[PDB]
Amino acid sequence: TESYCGPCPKNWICYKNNCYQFFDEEKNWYESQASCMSQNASLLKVYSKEDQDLLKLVKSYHWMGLVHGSWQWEDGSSLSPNLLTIIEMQKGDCALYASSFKGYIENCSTPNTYICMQRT
Amino acid sequence: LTESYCGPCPKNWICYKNNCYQFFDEEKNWYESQASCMSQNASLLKVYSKEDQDLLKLVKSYHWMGLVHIPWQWEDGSSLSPNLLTIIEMQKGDCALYASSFKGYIENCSTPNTYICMQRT
Numbered sequence: 061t062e063s064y065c066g067p068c069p070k071n072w073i074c075y076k077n078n079c080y081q082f083f084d085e086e087k088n089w090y091e092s093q094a095s096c097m098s099q100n101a102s103l104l105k106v107y108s109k110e111d112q113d114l115l116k117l118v119k120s121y122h123w124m125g126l127v128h129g130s131w132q133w134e135d136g137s138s139l140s141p142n143l144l145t146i147i148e149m150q151k152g153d154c155a156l157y158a159s160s161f162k163g164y165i166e167n168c169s170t171p172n173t174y175i176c177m178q179r180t
Numbered sequence: 181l182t183e184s185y186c187g188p189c190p191k192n193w194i195c196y197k198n199n200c201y202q203f204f205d206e207e208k209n210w211y212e213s214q215a216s217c218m219s220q221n222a223s224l225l226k227v228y229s230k231e232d233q234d235l236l237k238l239v240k241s242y243h244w245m246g247l248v249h250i251p252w253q254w255e256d257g258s259s260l261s262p263n264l265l266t267i268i269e270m271q272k273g274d275c276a277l278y279a280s281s282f283k284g285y286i287e288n289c290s291t292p293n294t295y296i297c298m299q300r301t
């Protein structure tokens with residue numbers, strides 16, 4: 061059964077109506093967030109293991125929009141339970157995504173590659 | 181930054197510039213990989229444009245694509261376009277594995293490997 065996906069800009073991957081773009085130039089969390097904002101987007105937000113099962117295929121670790129009450133996303137929403145295994149890697153208030161559905165606590169100032177996400 | 185729809189594609193496939201891609205991690209020889217994609221109304225990965233398929237720069241590891249040597253051409257019988265892939269020998273054979281960036285590694289067609297299927301409506 062075929063269906064259309066998006067909408068998304070042309071250079072973004074579309075999957076279950078979310079749009080993803082990988083950035084390989086390393087930036088700290090704040091610079092990564094600013095980069096995504098300049099593309100009318102945000103850093104990766106993880107909300108569903110089903111809608112976002114493609115994240116099982118992501119290799120290496122990349123900034124997502126999770127920051128430190130509890131951890132929260134850029135949009136102010138809380139991290140849903142039973143989505144990510146949080147592991148402590150560095151003293152930090154930001155998190156990297158790693159497969160499969162892990163979040164590494166990371167110094168916000170450390171340069172990393174990053175994933176932007178859009179949903180119209 | 182202009183928005184457009186991508187596809188159509190089945191829901192469990194990645195869509196990029198209106199092509200649909202699916203990665204398969206259960207390793208199969210080239211022929212069984214071809215048959216698996218066919219059972220999904222698809223073919224093994226065909227590389228026809230660096231610009232429309234620039235996401236392939238981000239593909240890690242090595243995966244069957246639909247490129248074969250008649251003792252190079254694609255499953256559909258079309259010939260490999262120039263200026264697309266750098267073909268490197270690895271294991272004696274008549275089939276090729278895709279690797280980043282826009283490389284093809286020659287591989288025995290009977291060797292089990294992961295594979296990428298591609299659909300286009």
Ligand SMILES: CN(C)C(=O)[C@@H](NC(=O)c1cnccc1-c1ccc(C(F)(F)F)cc1)c1cc(C(F)(F)F)cc(C(F)(F)F)c1
Pocket residue numbers: 073080081082114115116117118119120175194201203235236237238239240241
């Ligand atoms: C599945 N295999 C065998 C890989 O090679 C994976 N590579 C990396 O994740 C990968 C490897 N090095 C650098 C960057 C990436 C990467 C990071 C974020 C995204 C995202 F923007 F999507 F979030 C996509 C790729 C892979 C996974 C996926 C996805 F989306 F399913 F996760 C798509 C591809 C693509 F089609 F683009 F090539 C490749």
